[PDB]
Scaffold this motif. Structure first.
Motif, PDB file in Angstrom:
ATOM      1  N   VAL B 181       0.832  -1.198   0.000  1.00 41.66           N
ATOM      2  CA  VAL B 181       0.000   0.000   0.000  1.00 41.66           C
ATOM      3  C   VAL B 181       0.868   1.251   0.000  1.00 41.66           C
ATOM      4  O   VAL B 181       0.610   2.203  -0.745  1.00 41.66           O
ATOM      5  CB  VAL B 181      -0.962  -0.020   1.202  1.00 41.66           C
ATOM      6  N   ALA B 182       1.910   1.272   0.833  1.00 39.15           N
ATOM      7  CA  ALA B 182       2.792   2.432   0.881  1.00 39.15           C
ATOM      8  C   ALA B 182       3.467   2.680  -0.460  1.00 39.15           C
ATOM      9  O   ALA B 182       3.704   3.835  -0.830  1.00 39.15           O
ATOM     10  CB  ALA B 182       3.841   2.246   1.975  1.00 39.15           C
ATOM     11  N   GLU B 183       3.785   1.618  -1.201  1.00 38.93           N
ATOM     12  CA  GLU B 183       4.422   1.785  -2.503  1.00 38.93           C
ATOM     13  C   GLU B 183       3.474   2.451  -3.493  1.00 38.93           C
ATOM     14  O   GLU B 183       3.798   3.486  -4.085  1.00 38.93           O
ATOM     15  CB  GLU B 183       4.891   0.430  -3.034  1.00 38.93           C
ATOM     16  N   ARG B 184       2.291   1.865  -3.686  1.00 41.92           N
ATOM     17  CA  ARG B 184       1.320   2.437  -4.614  1.00 41.92           C
ATOM     18  C   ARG B 184       0.981   3.873  -4.238  1.00 41.92           C
ATOM     19  O   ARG B 184       0.935   4.759  -5.099  1.00 41.92           O
ATOM     20  CB  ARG B 184       0.058   1.578  -4.642  1.00 41.92           C
ATOM     21  N   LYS B 185       0.738   4.124  -2.950  1.00 47.23           N
ATOM     22  CA  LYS B 185       0.418   5.477  -2.512  1.00 47.23           C
ATOM     23  C   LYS B 185       1.536   6.453  -2.853  1.00 47.23           C
ATOM     24  O   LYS B 185       1.271   7.630  -3.124  1.00 47.23           O
ATOM     25  CB  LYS B 185       0.143   5.488  -1.009  1.00 47.23           C
ATOM     26  N   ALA B 186       2.787   5.989  -2.849  1.00 44.67           N
ATOM     27  CA  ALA B 186       3.901   6.872  -3.176  1.00 44.67           C
ATOM     28  C   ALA B 186       3.919   7.213  -4.661  1.00 44.67           C
ATOM     29  O   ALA B 186       4.156   8.368  -5.034  1.00 44.67           O
ATOM     30  CB  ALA B 186       5.221   6.225  -2.760  1.00 44.67           C
ATOM     31  N   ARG B 188       1.479   7.487  -6.693  1.00 46.76           N
ATOM     32  CA  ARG B 188       0.443   8.471  -6.987  1.00 46.76           C
ATOM     33  C   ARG B 188       0.935   9.885  -6.706  1.00 46.76           C
ATOM     34  O   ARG B 188       0.653  10.813  -7.473  1.00 46.76           O
ATOM     35  CB  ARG B 188      -0.811   8.166  -6.171  1.00 46.76           C
ATOM     36  N   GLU B 189       1.674  10.069  -5.611  1.00 46.82           N
ATOM     37  CA  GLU B 189       2.219  11.383  -5.297  1.00 46.82           C
ATOM     38  C   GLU B 189       3.317  11.797  -6.267  1.00 46.82           C
ATOM     39  O   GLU B 189       3.567  12.997  -6.425  1.00 46.82           O
ATOM     40  CB  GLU B 189       2.762  11.399  -3.867  1.00 46.82           C
TER      41      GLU B 189
END
Ligand SMILES: [K+]
Ligand SMILES: [K+]
Ligand SMILES: [K+]
Ligand SMILES: [K+]
Ligand SMILES: [Mg+2]
Ligand SMILES: [Mg+2]
Ligand SMILES: [Mg+2]
Ligand SMILES: [Mg+2]
Ligand SMILES: [Mg+2]
Ligand SMILES: [Mg+2]
Ligand SMILES: [Mg+2]
Ligand SMILES: [Mg+2]
Ligand SMILES: [Mg+2]
Ligand SMILES: [Mg+2]
Ligand SMILES: [Mg+2]
Ligand SMILES: [Mg+2]
Ligand SMILES: [Mg+2]
Lengths: 290, 193, 53, 98
Positions: B181-186, B188-189
């Motif tokens: 989750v932290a990877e995908r969320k990064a 996007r930013e």
RNA sequence: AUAGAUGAGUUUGGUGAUGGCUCUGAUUGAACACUGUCCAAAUACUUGACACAUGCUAAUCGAACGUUUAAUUUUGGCUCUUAAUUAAAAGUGGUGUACAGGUGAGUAUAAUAUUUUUUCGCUUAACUUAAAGUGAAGGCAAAUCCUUCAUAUUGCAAAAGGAUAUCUAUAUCCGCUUUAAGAGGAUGAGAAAAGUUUCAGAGAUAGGUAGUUGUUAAGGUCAUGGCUUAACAAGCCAAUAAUUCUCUUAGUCGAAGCUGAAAAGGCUGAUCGACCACAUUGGGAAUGAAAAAAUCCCAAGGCAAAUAGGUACAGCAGUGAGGAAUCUUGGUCAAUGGGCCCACGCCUGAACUGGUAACUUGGAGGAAUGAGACGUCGAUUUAUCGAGUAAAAUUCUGUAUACAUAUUGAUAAUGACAAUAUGUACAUUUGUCUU
């Protein structure tokens, strides 16, 4: 912390008999009523009066809950058998007649006849009652602190309890610090000589000792807690007695717990200042605590 | 009773001993004023000096006993060490007209194998020869054809404690999920917005 | 000081101590032999047969 | 796998052990197959002995323990040290003399 | 176990009966109110199987196996490119997560249940003893992985390799396959004979059984049995509910807990042991010697996630909620137990220990002297009765506890924390109910 139950410990108005050698206690014991008034009291009012009187002396320093379960309905006793009788008779004569032995003429006929009938065969010392009621508080006589007070090593049951709690007693050569230890037949408890001389000796008075500075036998030694030369406490003779279940040796302040207190025909071994009427009501109270 | 063992060429002082066994014990190298203090202090004395946690103190007392009994780690039997570096060379004997036995011996970095005498030609345990002119064994780095050095390293004798990967078996799929989750969320930013 | 210094045994039936009932149990060890007959496990050459050298 | 091991009983700071015959993969204090004896780790002292010597009380049914060691029971390290003192097995560890 | 059997108040104008109610006894995993000095042991969400922030409870083996980058050292070419060593990080494989720990939601029973004696059978993992065999290819990057072959009394049927020394190839270490035994077992419907099992409460239902009951023949089985099959016969069980169904409630049991003088006593079903069931709810299979998983597959709603496919604390501590009401987000693997490992060793919220609560139990919580301070205080026959040996004061003790030393829990070595012993020192509360 002094509890409310110990305020008037030696009340001259209530006159409670306590287990100590205090001079106020001696007066309450000597002037105790020949018989408590139980004429018009109910059965509960009699059992409560007897329970209050007896518990003022027996196990005074033991909680009511602890003694309620320490109380035992088992009153031990013994009977004396003469070897001379058992060697000459096998007990058959006791079953003569219709099972209970031959009948003797009534009392209003014996003395009428100048000749007294031959002595009836039987074990000597029979037909004498046994005071079972007087053994209500026998279980208390087995505690270590109580046995010390009955051996005349302490002036009270509470002072003997402090000798135990303070590591001054030695049972079977091993240090014992539990006043509730129940002695076993054969145990030998020994108290320190210094604590016995102070407990039973006379108080250390400076005013009288101050006059004796310079003005077998013994000498003066103001470096000891008791008054020198050691003399017995005042009024100690009124409480001087050793029961038969102990074998004391004063030279070393040691005693052996030979056996448990028992009731013999015509005698009891539980030191109690109350009559069978009171000990019978106290026993009946602790059957169901009501 | 508290017999002290004599230092060895590979473990000459305390800082070296604490560096080998690992577990970050070289921090306390200053608590032990001498080599004789290490093998003399007791459990209670090591606790006052500050050797903690209890895991490190018990670990030290253990290796302290092994050193006495002579149960050294690897390279502890060396005899020619200099500044903490030992050179391993190969000694070849003709066991038969059609065979040759090769042994990994420890000799000075200058003298040749055939020059050394049987007394100084030490044979290190734990190291063997693979084929020809190849020294195989832990922490044996090659220097040239038929030579390899063995230097003192942090945790060289350490009993490494086991570690978890992604929190162990029970928390493996979750740590990887949340990490995903932290990877995908990064991303996007970075590229999403 | 020990009560065992002089041994004076008590006469029979002179005490009636009531021992308290002990709570809990222990596992009953299993039987290794049959209740009838002599098993082959206690013969002469049994061990040397089931545990040879 | 049968094992001759110890079951820790007693109270806080008052350890007491049962020597038992139980399967390895079972709870430590579960009811075992047999109770071979007891073991008290805290050393005691004779009552009337002023020499200072201490001892340890250990009740063990040697006859029952030998049968289980004979059929292939595996005693733990603690029970092994005890069985080696009585003279059933050989010690696993010894004090290095050098 | 031979001392163990008890009453009291209350109906009537009154009396004797009948018959409830209440009190008297013991107790709680209790709560509340008023209180409270210390210590030890033991116990501690009884309610929402309610929802859960965070850290942890199952890992281990490099002496099974190669990959991957790092430096180090060697080849060819003239920074690149070969072949290796070493260390780390992910993995592959072996074993273990089938044990331990938690909970009581569901579940209403006589069953291929169970005891005794006789007679037996099965067991390809682990443990113990021994014997024999441990060769040849292919697939994945490699292998002790997968596929397959040779050989193994006759003929069907197996295997796997890795590691360390010696000498101026040999011998060992740890494994693998098979076989014969011991132990163990959750094992076969084992069988025969004689027994045992207090099966919740209420209501309804008279049929149930179709290899089902028996015979003949055959097969199977250590053996027995429609266990299986063919051909015949129409039986067998039940009739007072056998059988089936609905509703309500519940984990079961034990001198395990409480209780009675006692009854095949009653009640409970915490802590302890045994058994059963469950792991958000529902629906399932495989692996394996054996499901005996907090595993795996699938669906649904909650939370998280979206181009993902995790999570469910009824593991430990902890938070919110609910409730009259039940505690620390500690230390250590030193001890006991367990998993992995040739060994050393690693791991263990199992466990051991420190903390919180008078919830309970046990113990301590001070003994002796104390007569005219010719003082005080409250009643009142103002002079009687009490506070009162009570206080003060005096003489002693050194209890919980504090400190110190030693020993001990542990030995091959390892002490987180504490116990016990000895020495020295200290005299510290009243509270509450009733009348
Ligand atoms: K389980
Ligand atoms: K349930
Ligand atoms: K919890
Ligand atoms: K451990
Ligand atoms: Mg009327
Ligand atoms: Mg609950
Ligand atoms: Mg339960
Ligand atoms: Mg081969
Ligand atoms: Mg019969
Ligand atoms: Mg059938
Ligand atoms: Mg339920
Ligand atoms: Mg939940
Ligand atoms: Mg609330
Ligand atoms: Mg262990
Ligand atoms: Mg080992
Ligand atoms: Mg003290
Ligand atoms: Mg250890």
């Amino acid at each position: 912390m002094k509890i409310r139950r110990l305020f008037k410990y030696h009340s001259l108005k209530k006159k409670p008999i306590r287990p100590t050698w205090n001079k106020y206690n001696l007066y309450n014991l000597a002037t105790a009523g020949r018989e408590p008034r139980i004429s018009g009291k109910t059965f509960f009012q009699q059992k409560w009066l007897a329970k209050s009187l007896t518990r003022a002396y027996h196990g005074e320093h033991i909680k009511e809950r602890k003694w309620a379960r320490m109380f035992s309905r088992r009153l031990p006793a013994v009977v004396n058998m003469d070897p001379a009788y058992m060697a000459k008779y096998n007990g058959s004569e006791q079953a003569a007649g219709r099972g209970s032995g031959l009948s003797e003429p009534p009392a209003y006929e014996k003395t009428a006849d100048e000749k007294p009938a031959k002595q009836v065969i039987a074990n000597p010392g029979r037909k004498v009652p046994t005071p079972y009621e007087q053994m209500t508080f026998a279980p208390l006589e087995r505690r270590l602190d109580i046995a010390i007070f009955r051996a005349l090593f302490a002036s009270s049951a509470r002072q003997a309890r402090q000798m135990v709690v303070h590591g001054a007693v030695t049972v079977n050569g091993k240090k014992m610090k539990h006043p509730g230890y129940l002695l076993n037949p054969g145990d030998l408890f020994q108290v320190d000589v210094e604590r016995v001389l102070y407990a039973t000796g006379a108080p250390k008075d400076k005013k009288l000792l101050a006059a004796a500075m310079k003005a077998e036998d013994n000498e003066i030694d103001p470096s000891k807690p008791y008054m020198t030369p050691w003399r017995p406490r005042n009024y100690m003779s009124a409480f001087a007695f050793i029961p038969r279940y102990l074998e004391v040796n004063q030279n070393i302040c040691a005693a052996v717990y030979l056996r448990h207190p028992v009731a013999r025909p015509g005698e009891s071994e539980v030191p109690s200042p109350f009559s069978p009427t009171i000990n019978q009501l106290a026993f009946n109270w602790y059957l169901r605590r009501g | 009773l508290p017999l002290i063992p004599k230092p060895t060429p590979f473990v000459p002082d305390v800082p070296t001993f604490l560096t080998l066994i690992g577990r970050d014990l070289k921090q306390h190298a200053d608590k032990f004023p001498t080599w004789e203090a290490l093998f003399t202090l007791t459990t209670d004395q090591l606790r006052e000096l500050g050797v903690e946690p209890p895991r490190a103190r018990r670990y030290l007392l253990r290796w302290r006993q092994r050193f006495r009994e002579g149960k050294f780690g690897i390279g502890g039997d060396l005899k020619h060490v200099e500044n903490g570096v030992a050179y391993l060379k190969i000694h070849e004997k003709e066991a038969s007209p059609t065979r040759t036995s090769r042994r990994v011996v420890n000799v000075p970095a200058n003298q040749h194998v055939e020059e050394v005498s049987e007394g100084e030609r030490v044979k290190v345990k734990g190291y063997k020869v693979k084929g020809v002119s190849t020294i195989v064994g832990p922490y044996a780095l090659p220097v040239q054809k038929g030579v390899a050095k063995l230097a003192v390293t942090e945790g060289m004798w350490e009993d490494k404690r086991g570690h978890k990967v992604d929190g162990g078996e029970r928390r493996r799929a979750e740590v990887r999920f949340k990490r995903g989750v932290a990877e995908r969320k990064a991303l996007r930013e970075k590229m999403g917005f | 000081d020990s009560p065992n210094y002089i041994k004076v045994p008590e006469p029979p039936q002179s005490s009636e101590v009531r021992h308290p009932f002990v709570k809990g149990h222990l596992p009953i060890p299993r039987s290794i032999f049959p209740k009838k007959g002599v098993p082959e496990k206690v013969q002469s050459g049994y061990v040397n047969r089931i545990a040879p050298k | 796998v049968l094992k001759l091991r110890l079951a820790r009983f007693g109270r806080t700071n008052a350890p007491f052990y049962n020597i038992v015959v139980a399967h390895a993969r079972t709870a430590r204090n579960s009811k075992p197959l047999e109770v071979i004896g007891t073991y008290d780790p805290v050393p005691k002292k004779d009552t009337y002995d002023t020499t200072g010597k201490l001892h340890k009380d250990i009740k063990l049914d040697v006859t029952r323990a030998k049968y289980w060691i004979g059929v292939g029971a595996q005693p733990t390290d603690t029970v092994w040290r005890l069985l080696s003192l009585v003279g059933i097995l050989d010690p696993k560890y010894k004090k290095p003399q050098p």
